[PDB]
Structures are given as structure tokens and as C-alpha cells.
Design a protein around this motif. Structure first.
Motif, short mmCIF file in Angstrom:
data_model
loop_
_atom_site.label_atom_id
_atom_site.label_comp_id
_atom_site.label_asym_id
_atom_site.label_seq_id
_atom_site.Cartn_x
_atom_site.Cartn_y
_atom_site.Cartn_z
N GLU A 15 -7.13 -5.13 -8.74
CA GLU A 15 -7.56 -3.59 -8.22
C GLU A 15 -8.49 -3.42 -7.26
N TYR B 93 0.71 -1.21 0.06
CA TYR B 93 -0.10 -0.13 0.06
C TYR B 93 0.95 1.46 0.25
N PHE C 140 2.75 1.80 -3.29
CA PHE C 140 1.71 2.27 -4.29
C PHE C 140 1.57 3.94 -4.26
N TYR D 41 -5.16 -1.43 -5.20
CA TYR D 41 -3.88 -0.95 -5.88
C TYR D 41 -3.69 -2.16 -7.37
N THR E 50 -1.57 6.96 -8.03
CA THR E 50 -2.73 6.82 -7.43
C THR E 50 -3.83 7.60 -8.04
#
Ligand SMILES: Oc1cccc(CN(CCN2CCCC2)c2nc3ccc(-c4ccncc4)cc3s2)c1
Lengths: 18, 309
Positions: B213, A3, A6, B218, A12
Motif C-alpha cells: 500500500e 488505481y 481502487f 492502494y 479509499t
């Protein structure tokens, strides 16, 4: 974490096509 | 169903509807989104009071970036297709400067927004949307249409909480193989990157990227720049979050398969391999098509040559 990785990537937001 | 759908499709595709409205029949309210050749606006048909999403495209700009064909082809598919998970095109026209596409307005906004807000969707919430994409691709693939731009940004959520696919800018009617380097980096199949002559199986890979996703928050492959993402996709090295069910991992290992000789959706049973998979056992396929399953989320926008058209 994955996370955090990312977020680290500035990908994002809304992605455009190539 | 698919034969009647193909028959309905072919008639409209072979004889497309042109000039079914004018710019003076609409009150422009707000910008909903923005693209390469123009914007999408919330609009009001003044002589009925009905709201619509108006896609405005600058002809000069379309010619400028050499996207004439892809532009003509999008309106042509939009006016010829008919499926509950594909936005209905209400009118299309042109003036001196622009091309206009007037569609049904989808107030719920992009799946993208909701997904970035919630963080991630539960597996039942991810499956509900997955099922809609499986049926949509089965409909498009049977019509020889390759979609090539699946991502949460192209999937709008309606009042009933069902998906509406809006963008057909990279869709192509092709029976066999095609070569264009197009799509979005995170969703590009390895065969597109590795510059092979690819087919419909790219959409089934993009489904794996989407399912992943939606369930994680993600994509399975990301990095700062496209080139680094391309490397991860071609390697086929995929790590899964520990909350992913055993069934989810197995479907994904088969969807995100580099060897399209082994990729689910590309085997002799085709789509039935995805539909019959364990992860989809509780899925009432006919009820989803019929929009009789209750949505787990009921809703949303940010602030901002052509002869055949
Ligand atoms: O050359 C152009 C010009 C304008 C726009 C585009 C593509 N984009 C923008 C780019 N994409 C979105 C983020 C990443 C990629 C769009 N297309 C649509 C289509 C329909 C609706 C809509 C339908 C119903 N109700 C509400 C909104 C919204 C959008 S936003 C390309």
C-alpha cells in the motif's frame, strides 16, 4: 487501471476494524 | 537489549500504574479523531503548558459493546511497553462516566492522510517506514505481544518524521495460538479469515499489505465489501505495479505468503530473513532504531468491571 478500480471501490477512506 | 526490554516490560505489566492525573488538570482544545467508545482530543496540561492527545472512552458504551477486556488490556500494554516507535502513555485515570488515556501528542497526523495526498511513497520512502515496523514487531513479538491492527491509519508521523503506533485495542499477550476474528479487512491474514488458530505471523503478512500500500497507493486486495476482499486474500493472487522493483516484489511474495510454513518472519531465522533481504540492503537497522537516519518527509488532522484500570 488498478488505481481507477481502487477508487471504484468505496474503500479509499479511513477503514474501521471488523 | 530484548532481555532488558523484557525485564523492564514484565515489572510494569505485573504492577500497572493507575490514576496518575485528573480531568480538571487539562484544557480540552479540539477533537483529533473518533472511535467506537469515544474520541481523541488535543489537550493542554494547564500546570506545565504541555500538549497531549487525550483518548476518552465511555465505560457504559465499552460495557454495551462487550469490549471490557480489550479496553483494560490496551491501557495495560500502553503503560508497560517502551520503544521509540510506540506512543508514550503519559497518564491514565477514570471518573464516574469515563476512562482516560493521556499520550504524547503527535502533530504530524496519520500516515494515511499523507499517503492519500501524495498518492504513493517512493521505495526509499516506503522502506524507511517498513524498517520502523520491522523493529517495532520484533520488540512486541519478543514480549509475546501480537499487534493485529497494522494499517496507515494507526501510524502517526512525528516532528522528526518517524512513526508512532497509537492503537493497541486488538493487541494480545499470547505465546502460541489465538482465535479471535479481529483486525481490518484489507490487512487480515488468510489464516484469520479461514478461521484457523493463528499466531504472530499475521503481523508479518500485514507488513506485506502495508509495504505494498505504501509503494502503490492502494492495498494488494480491495473490493466494495469485506467478503469479496476475503476471497482475494485466501486465493493469494497478487498483482504488482510495473514500477515495483524486482527486490520489492520478491520481499512481498515472501511476506504475502499464504503458507505460513514459508512466510518470512515465521521461518527459523525469524525477523533476520526480512532484515537480510535485498530490498533492505541500504537499511542501517541500528541507525533507524536510534532515529539517526534523516526522514524523507517532515510534516494534519480532520475536523470533527473497570477496577484494574
Ligand atoms: O474506542 C475508541 C475511542 C476513540 C478512538 C479509538 C481509535 N481511534 C479511531 C479509529 N482508527 C483511526 C482510523 C481508523 C481506525 C484512534 N485512536 C487514536 C489514538 C491516538 C491518537 C493520537 C495520538 C497522538 N497524537 C495525536 C493523535 C489518535 C487516535 S484515533 C477507539
Amino acid at each position: 487501471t488498478t488505481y481507477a478500480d481502487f477508487i471504484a471501490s468505496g474503500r479509499t477512506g479511513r477503514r474501521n476494524a471488523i | 537489549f530484548l532481555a532488558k526490554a523484557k525485564e523492564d516490560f514484565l515489572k510494569k505489566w505485573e504492577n500497572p500504574a493507575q490514576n496518575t492525573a485528573h480531568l480538571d488538570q487539562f484544557e480540552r482544545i479540539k477533537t483529533l479523531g473518533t472511535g467506537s467508545f469515544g474520541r481523541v482530543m488535543l489537550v493542554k496540561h494547564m500546570e506545565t503548558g504541555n500538549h497531549y492527545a487525550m483518548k476518552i472512552l465511555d465505560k457504559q458504551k465499552v460495557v454495551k459493546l462487550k469490549q471490557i477486556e480489550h479496553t483494560l488490556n490496551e491501557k495495560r500494554i500502553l503503560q508497560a511497553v517502551n520503544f521509540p516507535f510506540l506512543v508514550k502513555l503519559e497518564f491514565s485515570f477514570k471518573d464516574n462516566s469515563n476512562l482516560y488515556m493521556v499520550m504524547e501528542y503527535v502533530p504530524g497526523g496519520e500516515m494515511f492522510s499523507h499517503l492519500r495526498r501524495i498518492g504513493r511513497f517512493s521505495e526509499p520512502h516506503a522502506r524507511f517506514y517498513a524498517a520502523q515496523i520491522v523493529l517495532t514487531f520484533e520488540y512486541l513479538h519478543s514480549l509475546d505481544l501480537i499487534y493485529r491492527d497494522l494499517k496507515p491509519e494507526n501510524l502517526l508521523i512525528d516532528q522528526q518524521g518517524y512513526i508512532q503506533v497509537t492503537d493497541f485495542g486488538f493487541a494480545k499477550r499470547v505465546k502460541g495460538r489465538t482465535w479471535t476474528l479481529c483486525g481490518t479487512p484489507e490487512y487480515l491474514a488468510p489464516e484469520i479469515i479461514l478461521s484457523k488458530g493463528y499466531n504472530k505471523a499475521v503481523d508479518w503478512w500485514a507488513l506485506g499489505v502495508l509495504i505494498y500500500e505504501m509503494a502503490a497507493g492502494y492495498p494488494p486486495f480491495f473490493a466494495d465489501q469485506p467478503i469479496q476482499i476475503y476471497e482475494k486474500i485466501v486465493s493469494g493472487k497478487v498483482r504488482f505495479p510495473s514500477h515495483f522493483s524486482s527486490d520489492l516484489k520478491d520481499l512481498l511474495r515472501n511476506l504475502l505468503q499464504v503458507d505460513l510454513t514459508k512466510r518470512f518472519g515465521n521461518l527459523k531465522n525469524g525477523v533476520n530473513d526480512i532484515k537480510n533481504h535485498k530490498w533492505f540492503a541500504t537499511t542501517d537497522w541500528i541507525a533507524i532504531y536510534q532515529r539517526k537516519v534523516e526522514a524523507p518527509f517532515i510534516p494534519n488532522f480532520d475536523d470533527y468491571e473497570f477496577s484494574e484500570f
